[model samples]
Target chain A: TMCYSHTTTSRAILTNCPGETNCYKKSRRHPPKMVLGRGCGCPTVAPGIKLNCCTTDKCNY
Target chain B: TMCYSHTTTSRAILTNCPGETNCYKKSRRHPPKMVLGRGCGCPTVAPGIKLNCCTTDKCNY
Candidate 1:
């Protein structure tokens, strides 16, 4: 199974990854951050933002 | 007047800075980015994210 992860200021479960396995995580911050899946690929970086992507089972942890 | 700036993935205007002058700017990205005022200080970096803060007139440009 594969999954993705990234940080976000918004709150909501994201399951739009291209795989059957997907997950999301949240962190403590001023505006808060969310980590979720990315179907395109792993190890992706959001330009000019703090979002990151990874691949692995429960990688968001 | 002084202004502040930072990047965001969310839309909508933000003006919660502690100063009278405030402004916001948007950048094109996958999720999009927004730059706005931060009264706390200038040159601030959002933890684990690419968001940055600057103080000046229309500094977001």
Candidate 2:
């Protein structure tokens, strides 16, 4: 599959979520939300493919 | 010096491309090419500092 997951931030733990994926707040039970960053998606959770987020006005890669 | 531009992709509206700077598709005469967030240039049409695009990949600043 064309995994479209990855992250922008350097920290292992992510906070803000994007519009394309479901991100949890450090827990699985917690329903995922939409945040923002610079990658395509969450690689740690998904894998391979990279998502995209918004930092200021740029669609981070 | 050191004035990396800004541009992610929200309402302002920028295109896509990566490698370096140069983006213009609205007003302006017509010169530059290369779009794609994950900042480094385009500071409010070239101004202050604070540019970083892309939302799904890690970058070094």
Candidate 3:
């Protein structure tokens, strides 16, 4: 599958993935900018944030 | 000034705003799209979501 990816330090991009049939876009609203993360559930997320997952390319778009 | 308004659905637009010198932008992570709201903190938000507030015209832009 494929997914959209973003990090606090990196720019957003589309990445191809192996394993897992899902993608996700999680965000943290701080100030001025939204601290966000996206991928095929690549990284384990912590508690207390908004996370949405799906099973398609950039479904987390 | 004006601010953006949105839910889990479209119909996003900029509406006239009053009070509060600062503007804000808030959002929730939803599959495929992000549930978002923007303005001078026009509405109150619930827990477990992202919220950002800013000062200046369209600072939330």
lDDT leader:
3
Cα lDDT of all candidates, in order?
0.38, 0.29, 0.60
User: Which residue ranges in model 2 land beyond 4 Å of their true spot?
Assistant: A1-8, A14-34, A37-61, B1-9, B15-61
lDDT of 2 at A49: 22
Clashing pairs in 3: none
**Candidate 2 lDDT, B16-40, residue by residue in tens:** 4375443322211221112223333
Name the TM-score of candidate 3: 0.43
lDDT of 3 at B61: 59
| Residue A59 local lDDT, model 3 | 84
lDDT, candidate 2, A1-61, per-residue tens: 1122222322233234445443222111221212323233333543222333333322331
Sorted on DockQ, best first, the list reads 1, 3, 2
Q: What is candidate 1's lDDT per residue for A1-61, written digit by digit as tens?
A: 5443333423222344665443433222223232322333444344433543445564555
DockQ of each: 0.08, 0.02, 0.04
Please say which candidate is ahead in DockQ: 1 or 2. 1
Weakest ten-residue segment in model 3 chain A by summed lDDT: A27-36
Instruction: Return whichever of 2 and 3 wins on DockQ.
Output: 3
| CAPRI quality of model 2 | incorrect
> lDDT per residue, candidate 3, B1-61, as tens digits?
5665443323455655676666667665443234355655645666544677766666675
